[PDB]
Amino acid sequence: DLVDAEGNLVETGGTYYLLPHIWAHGGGIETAKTGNEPCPLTVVRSPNEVSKGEPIRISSQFLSLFIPRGSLVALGFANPPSCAASPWWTVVDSPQGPAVKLSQQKLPEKDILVFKFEKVSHSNIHVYKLLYCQHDVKCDQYIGIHRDRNGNRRLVVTEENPLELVLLKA
């Protein structure tokens, strides 16, 4: 089962902060308004090292209390921007590649259950990598960062330098 910063089991009945292994890379996971977006529909990493970011909500494909190792999950926000229809993140096509976004129309359970945590072989500090999965399901792709012209650290599918996280219960 998944585990938070304090070695406790992660619970879908709670909210957490998705922080970095190293507190030099940045802060928590936020929202930002990029491109021609009428509001903050882009899921980004805060440039501020202190910043805990937005409180995140997790849900297991098994609709249970804990998340079993390798089980698919939906990652969404506790408090989304009014303009979004649902609090869940989804992954759409972008010039930069598969990007993590929020949507202006409701999303089926089948298109938010596209995340899977993968523990990092580092020990006694509970860390994880975030994988994206599609249909053909297949989670061979990792989520990293793409800094745009305006400084936004967008979450997208990168080839290398993938995200590494620890879940801090709020």
Side-chain angles (χ1 to χ4, degrees), residues 31-51:
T31 55
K33 200 182 69 172
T34 76
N36 333 102
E37 301 185 312
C39 63
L41 298 179
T42 296
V43 174
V44 305
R45 161 175 271 178
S46 166
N48 305 198
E49 311 76 0
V50 54
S51 194

Side-chain angles (χ1 to χ4, degrees), residues 65-129:
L65 199 44
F66 309 152
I67 299 80
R69 169 191 71 274
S71 54
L72 279 175
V73 298
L75 294 173
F77 289 109
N79 304 288
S82 50
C83 69
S86 74
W88 305 105
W89 309 347
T90 191
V91 185
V92 295
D93 299 302
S94 81
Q96 300 73 46
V100 182
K101 312 280 187 168
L102 292 177
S103 176
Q104 282 189 296
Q105 60 154 27
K106 301 175 188 302
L107 304 158
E109 206 198 11
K110 120 189 194 183
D111 294 341
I112 51 178
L113 226 26
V114 309
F115 295 96
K116 170 183 297 211
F117 285 103
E118 180 178 289
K119 203 156 177 174
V120 159
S121 352
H122 134 150
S123 210
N124 253 288
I125 286 263
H126 282 89
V127 180
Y128 303 97
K129 282 178 185 174

